[PDB]
Amino acid sequence: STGSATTTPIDSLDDAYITPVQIGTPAQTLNLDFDTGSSDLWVFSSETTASEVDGQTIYTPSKSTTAKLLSGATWSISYGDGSSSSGDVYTDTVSVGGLTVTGQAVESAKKVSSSFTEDSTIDGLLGLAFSTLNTVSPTQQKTFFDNAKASLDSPVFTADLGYHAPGTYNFGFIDTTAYTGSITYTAVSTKQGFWEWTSTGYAVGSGTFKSTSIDGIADTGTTLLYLPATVVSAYWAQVSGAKSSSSVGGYVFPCSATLPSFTFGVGSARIVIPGDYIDFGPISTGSSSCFGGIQSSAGIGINIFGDVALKAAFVVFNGATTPTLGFASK
Ligand SMILES: Cc1ccc(/C=C/N)s1
């Protein structure tokens, strides 16, 4: 089997991407944030505290003839931005772009933090990291990809995120028309539960490539590119007036600037992020200070190849017995 679904930016900045997902019988379609940095499929639901729902579409398990309570199971998750959610668990039929999994754990939120309530466009998350990170207790649950894998034509999914435009998530096949050149594959460590890999270096604009190993994760659920402070300082030093602002929480730059590109290495190959992809717009409405798309990872504990980096590539998440990642230009 295969599946193919369009993913759409939630706003004009590409702050996140939503993909429609069918849950239950008859189908209830929710728009989920596909997140290769976590491993829980959770949704706003008829069980979510009413004051914490503001415009989201909810899953109502009592209206699904295939829903079954997973008795005794609870979940609770905290993310890198400080947001969180928790609740109980149903199994139900879940379909993505024509690919159907029966018995998928659907984690129904009883509580969500304010940042989720405030994002009316995101009805939940669909985790695509390794199932060892799934938070369901006392019986850990499998991700949608892990459940689908055996049925897929090939044990892979691909992320093709657009810049200010829709893109595609494919399951079970590699669309050879969706990228240019060849795909360069690179090793993955699953030890922390992430799609963790080592970039071979970077360049700023037209500058020379610096060969240096940068361990990080491929995370479709993180907006920005978070890299070591040395790398990030070298980038912003090429932008007149750019500075790190403790009050804003990162590097800002004059909105009048033209940003240089940023290149990252994948083995001997190179992915080029155009400068425009690094502009996240005014820090507050009407400001002439703009927020940068490349930020320091120093306070995180891990480097994160988020959407800023991934949207510049066609990315293969290869879930073979030994997982690997593939990157192609597009
Ligand atoms: C909207 C989102 C908040 C936290 C997420 C997890 C990123 N890996 S996605």
Descriptive account of the structure:
The chain has 330 residues and is mostly beta strands. It folds into two domains: 5-174, Acid Proteases (Cathepsin D, subunit A, domain 1), CATH 2.40.70.10; 175-330, Beta Barrel (Cathepsin D, subunit A, domain 1), CATH 2.40.70. It has four helices and 24 strands. The chain has a seven-stranded mixed beta sheet. The longest helix is centred in the last third of the chain and has 8 residues, at 229-236. It is globular, with a radius of gyration of 20 Å. The two termini are 25 Å apart. It binds (E)-2-(5-methylthiophen-2-yl)ethen-1-amine (A1CFW). The site of (E)-2-(5-methylthiophen-2-yl)ethen-1-amine has 13 residues, from strand 3. Its EC number is 3.4.23.22. Belongs to the peptidase A1 family. One of its GO terms (molecular function) is aspartic-type endopeptidase activity. The active site is at residues 35, 199.
